[PDB]
């Protein structure tokens, strides 16, 4: 791909984070803590899952960023509407305002309803995310495999401002403690 020149500097929004997440001083890394991180509750925080939003809001244009997923067993990445549900149980789907892919139990899937199997020969250590607001496209790229395409959501109906979306996943196994990191431009 040739999307690198639309690179944007994403930072994480602490106020949206699940109360167990630990966000680095530079707001570029996030990991699951082993306990509540001693913050007050608020209506923005994701309650049920280890999720957090980027601070940036996009309503036009082309945007690109990269995320490091090295040695994680489980995670979700993509974009979502600014007005997605924060509290209780929900599925990641375009109907609910999410355009995402994930790793879970050694398989990669796109967050359609129902979910779509992804075909990845080279397990990615870094994922590139491209959004074309006007075209209604969200695309995912395998940076470890020379930028190969993972998945394209097309005919997207965003229906609002978009925010970068992250889930570091649970760590029931003891093998999923590693952080998500926003990679430098």
Kindly list the residues in this chain that would bind ligand BP4 in the complex (CB under 6 A): 41-43, 87
Cβ proximity to ligand BP4, 42 vs 154, nearer residue: 42
Whole-angstrom Cα Rg for the chain: 15
CB of 81 to ligand BP4, least distance (A): 17
d(CA 119, CA 151): 9
* Structural tokens at position 114: 């129902």
Decide: 105 and 31 in contact? Cβ < 8 Å: no
> Shortest distance, CB of residue 88 to ligand BP4, whole angstroms?
7
65 - beta bridge partners? 129
Q: Which is nearer to ligand BP4, 28 or 81 (CB)?
A: 81
Query: Which residue's CB is nearer to ligand BP4, number 89 or number 117?
Result: 89
Q: CB of residue 114 vs ligand BP4: minimum separation in angstroms?
A: 26
Kindly report the number of other CB atoms within 10 A of residue 19's CB atom.
17
Query: Edge-to-edge, what's the strand order for the sheet holding 98-104?
Result: 51-53, 162-167, 75-81, 98-104, 107-110, 116-117
Smallest separation, CB 180 to ligand BP4 (Å): 25
Nearer to ligand BP4, 26 or 41 (CB): 41
């Amino acid at each position: 791909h040739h999307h690198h020149h639309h690179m944007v500097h994403i930072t994480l929004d602490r106020n949206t984070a699940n109360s167990w997440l630990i966000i680095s001083k530079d707001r570029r890394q996030v990991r699951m803590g082993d306990t509540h991180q001693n913050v007050s509750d608020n209506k923005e925080r994701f309650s049920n899952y280890p999720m957090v939003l980027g601070a940036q809001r996009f309503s036009s244009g082309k945007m690109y960023w990269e995320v490091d997923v090295t040695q994680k067993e489980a995670w979700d990445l993509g974009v979502c509407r600014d007005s997605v549900q924060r509290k209780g149980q929900f599925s990641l789907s375009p109907e609910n305002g999410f355009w995402t892919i994930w790793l879970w139990q050694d398989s990669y899937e796109a967050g359609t309803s129902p979910q779509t199997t992804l075909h990845i020969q080279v397990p990615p250590c870094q994922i590139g995310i491209f959004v074309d607001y006007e075209a209604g496209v969200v695309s995912f790229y395998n940076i470890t495999d020379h930028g190969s395409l993972i998945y394209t959501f097309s005919e997207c109906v965003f229906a609002g401002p978009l925010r970068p979306f992250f889930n570091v996943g649970f760590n029931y196994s003891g093998g999923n403690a590693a952080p998500l990191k926003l990679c430098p431009l």
